[PDB]
């Protein structure tokens, strides 16, 4: 039996476990510039992965979503990084990566 | 990773948070669920039917701790 069949055979619904991590980045550029720098960095580091820059300026790596929070302090950008448990390894990897900042 | 199902009873969850060294835990009610509030990494844990959402600052050791306790209340498929 598969995992969804084994759920449906017991009448159960899937439980969504979701994480949103508030990543802080120092950047005095406009947040949109920051999001672009984040996109370029991740596209370079994760070359094997689907990495996108969406028309609203948000960034994704497979199904992990990275968005600007609402503008704060002018030199601190908050990047809300969100993923479900399906992408747990990728999600923790990305929040760990961004702890080291961005290319100069 | 496996599919998850099940429920997180908020009383029990809080009790296990205490067992694991968390104190000063605060709990809000929502229309049918709850939010657990922790000072550590300014964390909210939104507890709803078939939905748990952990929102916290970038404190990976804290996040992993909460992740693990939430998973102990769920079944893995």
Swiss-Prot record, chain A:
PTM per Swiss-Prot/TrEMBL: Sumoylated; sumoylation regulates its subcellular location and is required for integrator complex integrity.
Result, substituting residue 85 to C: In NEDMLOB; uncertain significance
Cellular compartments annotated: Nucleus; Cytoplasm
Signal sequence, start to end: none
Self-association and partners: Component of the Integrator complex, composed of core subunits INTS1, INTS2, INTS3, INTS4, INTS5, INTS6, INTS7, INTS8, INTS9/RC74, INTS10, INTS11/CPSF3L, INTS12, INTS13, INTS14 and INTS15. The core complex associates with protein phosphatase 2A subunits PPP2CA and PPP2R1A, to form the Integrator-PP2A (INTAC) complex. INTS11 is part of the RNA endonuclease subcomplex, composed of INTS4, INTS9, INTS11 and inositol hexakisphosphate (InsP6). Interacts with WDR73; interaction is required for the assembly of the RNA endonuclease subcomplex in the cytoplasm.
Function in brief: RNA endonuclease component of the integrator complex, a multiprotein complex that terminates RNA polymerase II (Pol II) transcription in the promoter-proximal region of genes.
Family: Belongs to the metallo-beta-lactamase superfamily. RNA-metabolizing metallo-beta-lactamase-like family. INTS11 subfamily.
Record disease entry: Neurodevelopmental disorder with motor and language delay, ocular defects, and brain abnormalities: An autosomal recessive disorder apparent from infancy or early childhood, and characterized by global developmental delay, intellectual disability, motor and speech impairment, and brain abnormalities. Specifically, brain imaging shows progressive cortical atrophy, cortical gyral simplification, and delayed myelination affecting cerebrum and cerebellum. Ocular defects can include optic atrophy, nystagmus, strabismus, and retinal dystrophy.
Protein name per UniProt: Integrator complex subunit 11
From Swiss-Prot, chain B:
Listed result of changing residue 63 to E: Abolished interaction with INTS11
Location within or outside the cell: Nucleus; Cytoplasm
Coiled coil, from the record: none
Misc. remarks from the entry: Although strongly related to RNA-specific endonuclease proteins, it lacks the HXHXDH motif that binds zinc and participates in the catalytic center. Its function as endonuclease is therefore unsure.
Protein family per UniProt: Belongs to the metallo-beta-lactamase superfamily. RNA-metabolizing metallo-beta-lactamase-like family. INTS9 subfamily.
Assembly description: Component of the Integrator complex, composed of core subunits INTS1, INTS2, INTS3, INTS4, INTS5, INTS6, INTS7, INTS8, INTS9/RC74, INTS10, INTS11/CPSF3L, INTS12, INTS13, INTS14 and INTS15. The core complex associates with protein phosphatase 2A subunits PPP2CA and PPP2R1A, to form the Integrator-PP2A (INTAC) complex. INTS9 is part of the RNA endonuclease subcomplex, composed of INTS4, INTS9, INTS11 and inositol hexakisphosphate (InsP6). Interacts with WDR73; interaction is required for the assembly of the RNA endonuclease subcomplex in the cytoplasm.
Functional note: Component of the integrator complex, a multiprotein complex that terminates RNA polymerase II (Pol II) transcription in the promoter-proximal region of genes.
Protein name in UniProt: Integrator complex subunit 9
Lineage: Eukaryota, Metazoa, Chordata, Craniata, Vertebrata
Gene: INTS9
